[PDB]
Amino acid sequence: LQITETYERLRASHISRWGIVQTTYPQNIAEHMWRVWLLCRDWGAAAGMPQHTVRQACEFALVHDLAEIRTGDAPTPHKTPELKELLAGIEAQIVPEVAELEATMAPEARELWKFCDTAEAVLFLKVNGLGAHAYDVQHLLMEQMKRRLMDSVLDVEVQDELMFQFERTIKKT
Amino acid sequence: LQITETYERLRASHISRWGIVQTTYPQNIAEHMWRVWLLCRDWGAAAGMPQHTVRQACEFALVHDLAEIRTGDAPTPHKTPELKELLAGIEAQIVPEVAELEATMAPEARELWKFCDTAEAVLFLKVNGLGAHAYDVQHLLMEQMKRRLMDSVLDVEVQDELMFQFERTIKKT
Amino acid sequence: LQITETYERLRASHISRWGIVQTTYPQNIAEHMWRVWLLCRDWGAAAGMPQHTVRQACEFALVHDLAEIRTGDAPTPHKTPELKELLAGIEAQIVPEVAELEATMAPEARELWKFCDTAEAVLFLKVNGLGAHAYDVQHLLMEQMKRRLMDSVLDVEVQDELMFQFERTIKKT
Amino acid sequence: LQITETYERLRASHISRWGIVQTTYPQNIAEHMWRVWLLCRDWGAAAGMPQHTVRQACEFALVHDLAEIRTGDAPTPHKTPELKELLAGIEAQIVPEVAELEATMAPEARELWKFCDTAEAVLFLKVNGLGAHAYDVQHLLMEQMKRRLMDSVLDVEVQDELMFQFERTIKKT
Amino acid sequence: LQITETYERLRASHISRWGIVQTTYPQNIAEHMWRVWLLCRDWGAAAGMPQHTVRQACEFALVHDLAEIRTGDAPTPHKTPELKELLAGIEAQIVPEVAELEATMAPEARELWKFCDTAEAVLFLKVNGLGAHAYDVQHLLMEQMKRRLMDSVLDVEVQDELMFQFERTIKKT
Amino acid sequence: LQITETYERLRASHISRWGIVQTTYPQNIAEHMWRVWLLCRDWGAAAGMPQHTVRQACEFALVHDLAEIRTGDAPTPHKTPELKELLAGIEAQIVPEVAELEATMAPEARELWKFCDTAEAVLFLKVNGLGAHAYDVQHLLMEQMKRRLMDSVLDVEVQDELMFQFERTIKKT
Ligand SMILES: Nc1ncnc2c1ncn2[C@H]1C[C@H](O)[C@@H](CO)O1
Ligand SMILES: Nc1ncnc2c1ncn2[C@H]1C[C@H](O)[C@@H](CO)O1
Ligand SMILES: Nc1ncnc2c1ncn2[C@H]1C[C@H](O)[C@@H](CO)O1
Ligand SMILES: Nc1ncnc2c1ncn2[C@H]1C[C@H](O)[C@@H](CO)O1
Ligand SMILES: Nc1ncnc2c1ncn2[C@H]1C[C@H](O)[C@@H](CO)O1
Ligand SMILES: Nc1ncnc2c1ncn2[C@H]1C[C@H](O)[C@@H](CO)O1
Ligand SMILES: [Li+]
Ligand SMILES: [Li+]
Ligand SMILES: [Li+]
Ligand SMILES: [Li+]
Ligand SMILES: [Li+]
Ligand SMILES: [Li+]
Ligand SMILES: [Zn+2]
Ligand SMILES: [Zn+2]
Ligand SMILES: [Zn+2]
Ligand SMILES: [Zn+2]
Ligand SMILES: [Zn+2]
Ligand SMILES: [Zn+2]
């Protein structure tokens, strides 16, 4: 069950996202993780967050979905609290090193990562989603991203910078 | 959570299989279910199974993966007994009519359907799988299909006809 | 010429539709037939049509394009009366069992199937058509579907239910 | 019915070949016609055919499938003599200028074009065909190409040069 | 370095355009060159340009990007004067016969070809571009095409006919 | 010319590799950079290289191809010394921060990165290359990778560990 080999980790590019949403092509988790990393790096800096916090978010961004090489990527609405509890234990056996990183993340780093993880998905669908359901999902994700950010421990000035940058970015995407 | 609308059921063609395996294109569950239906129809008849049994397998084949419109399609190795128990309850809320059909299926109809469901996957990868992992998955599925068939309640003559037809079919695929 | 083998019938998923129209991906006839079957099942029931009629439409839906495994799928405008007459004889040699089903279909079952066959195509292009020609084809098909329905033997109440459901479905597609 | 507009002729790149054969992507008739043109140019010259003959083959190569913008591309085995007779009249209404060119082609130019048209298809499948049926089609086409060439009016020395070049080309494709 | 073999020239269909722009699929240079050829043929005739000029533009259209089989297709904004000077020498070694044709082209033939080369790209993106950057590129190309045409040696009546036909064509694409 | 905005950097996933090689799909530079990063991380550690060296290789891996968002990805054989000299100056204006990182890299970090950059390409083609040219490119890259490694400043024990891991990985890919 545990992922221990580079040949397995390389299969990040074989793991397709958006399994219940029509898209122009099957996005893989490697391109997703790179883009989330980029957002954490750029937007963490734009928001003036401490370097140690941005570094932690970026480190997690690059590995956070590796368990999906075994589990597959499952749709957000399907990940209820009960399923997430079961998946957390399974994922900790698959990638214990990722579980350890997740357990060490500071709340501010976690909230930067989560904002960027959802933002990347909205940005992806803006270009590559097809049809009414995909459009609804894009907009639902954007609402969820904003609600989570607003209720988070991030300072309001940081929240505002993240939304400033998100909106500038999506307009040009 | 429950799927009640035709516009949702049409999204069977938006649900991608093989989320952890490299393939030439993203196969959807609609084409999968049609092909499983075809195999149940043709191979149930070739094996001389009673018409009522073949009909039940075929009816289930056409709807059996509909819950994935909500849950996504998850990889076989990930569906452990504990996860399947949780998924069974969730899936019964998503598509109660499919759960009712599953609970009424005769063992012989279930075993025909399961053979055909796995055979379809092997046949798909024979053409459309890419790389060493996909090749291994194709062959693992074929071994699992044979083991399940051999240990099933189907008469040995039926088992042999199903394997006769499977092998003739894959040679020409 | 006759299709007699399961390995050939499985090639339904190798037969590409929309050969003269730009689309986001090549839809095959297996996913098309599954979706037409679904529409016949759901919309026949919504319209209160007799169970025997809906069953006949659904049975035909699952096999109706099998001859295309040999002939290819040809564009609707190209299928003039003279070509259709020639194709009918060829198709009857390719899939005599499908020709027999077609010759037994009740008019109401035929009109349900034809409505759903065209509706599926409109719905597909709504999501997956690309460019001005594809848009025109989508809208032409919708006009043809409505005209055929209005001139059909189906009761006006059935016609209205079919259009009610079609319009609700396409809005959400 | 007649194609008269550049916007319609540009849809050559919207017309997909291989409608009954699994391929890695949907090849269009524009890339096909360019490649057939290239083969006529290069192999006609290699074979020492008169410039006027090579020019005629090349001119036809660039337009020969334009009627498919209306008719679709249909599979070779389906084009029986009776269907071809009907299609010839339809195609002459669609693209009268192409029909006029075809009626003026010298036999040697026609045989160069036909060799190259089939060779291009073999070469395409060598790279992009998927599965056993596609492999069989590739090899059937190669046999048909050779038989037609051997029975043609082309001098044996020309036949041999065409096969010399075909075999060198496919080895490196 | 020099391209001398048909198997290499056939790789025109392996050379992907739009390497920095999101598109629905990877357009190759063979389909591009066919479409540019078509535009030169049709629009040169519509504009009443001399047959010898249209022929020269068409001949160049069919081969003009062959060096990209070695160099790759590079984005227009990246091709600065300094890079183009270096590329011109490299391309002349790759395809000396294409360089010779380019050096013989009459200015009016060159301007017809260049208009059509850019028009084809705009028309392609109209259908197949995805996202805001692709939209901007489509519109930038259209502005560049118009500016080059207006400043060219082509008579104003020819310029107007080319724009008349371009606008009619894109409206229907 | 300079890339300064997150919306531009996100277009890493819009930049297609393998522009002159047939592949099953268009790989983008984001998935490439993630995979190169992974190889640097895993294989640098397996080889016992100092943490500071592996970190530097990994940092560069994640950004090293960003200039291609403007320049496009060009084929290795085309990047002659003269072209690389010109590109180095252009790329330094596009992404000065990447040029600064490149100029600070220790030789051992550079050689780890270069090994992994080429290995990733071989591994990609092993799964996704199509046809004889792609096969030749895969094997040429593997020979180039080995020659560069053997002539590098890396200790022989490090070279051997890198080849040990590469060969184990490709066998399972
Ligand atoms: N509302 C939604 N409906 C369907 N799919 C969704 C939704 N939100 C996110 N996703 C996708 C994105 C990833 O593939 C996966 C979560 O990482 O789920
Ligand atoms: N061993 C396996 N590894 C990865 N994927 C697999 C395996 N077996 C089946 N599948 C896929 C097929 C369906 O998408 C889904 C089950 O219906 O899982
Ligand atoms: N007006 C039209 N123009 C082009 N293609 C069309 C049109 N109507 C239907 N189709 C397609 C759908 C199927 O592939 C096939 C008929 O089943 O034709
Ligand atoms: N034996 C065959 N089976 C299936 N398809 C075939 C066969 N031969 C040619 N083709 C395809 C190539 C074009 O799409 C079209 C003829 O131009 O038919
Ligand atoms: N402004 C632009 N940005 C990005 N890509 C562009 C632009 N203009 C043209 N192209 C593409 C089309 C061909 O692939 C190639 C030139 O033949 O460059
Ligand atoms: N020999 C070769 N022929 C063609 N393409 C090649 C070759 N080697 C590498 N590549 C590709 C990989 C990247 O897209 C790009 C370099 O990063 O060039
Ligand atoms: Li999807
Ligand atoms: Li997959
Ligand atoms: Li199409
Ligand atoms: Li095909
Ligand atoms: Li692109
Ligand atoms: Li490529
Ligand atoms: Zn994620
Ligand atoms: Zn199934
Ligand atoms: Zn149909
Ligand atoms: Zn042809
Ligand atoms: Zn060009
Ligand atoms: Zn690189």
Author numbering:
A (entry chain A), B (entry chain A), C (entry chain A), D (entry chain A), E (entry chain A), F (entry chain A): 3 to 175
Provide the authors' original text about this structure:
Here, we identify the enzyme that is responsible for genome duplication of the phage S-2L, a member of the PrimPol family, and we present its crystal structure. We confirm its polymerase activity but find that the enzyme is not specific to A or Z. Instead, we propose that the absence of A in S-2L genome is explained by a separate enzyme, an HD phosphohydrolase that specifically dephosphorylates dATP and that we name DatZ.
The electron density allowed to build the whole protein as well as 218 water molecules around the DatZ chain (175 aa), which is roughly the number expected for this resolution limit. The base moiety of dA snugly fits in the catalytic pocket below a relatively flexible element (as indicated by higher B-factors), with the P79 residue on its tip. A catalytic divalent ion is found in the vicinity of dA’s free 5′-OH group, even though no divalent ion was added in buffers during purification or crystallisation. The fact that no additional divalent ions were added during protein purification indicates a high affinity of DatZ for Zn2+. The whole hexamer is particularly rigid, as judged from the overall very low B-factors, which is consistent with the ultrahigh diffraction limit for DatZ crystals.
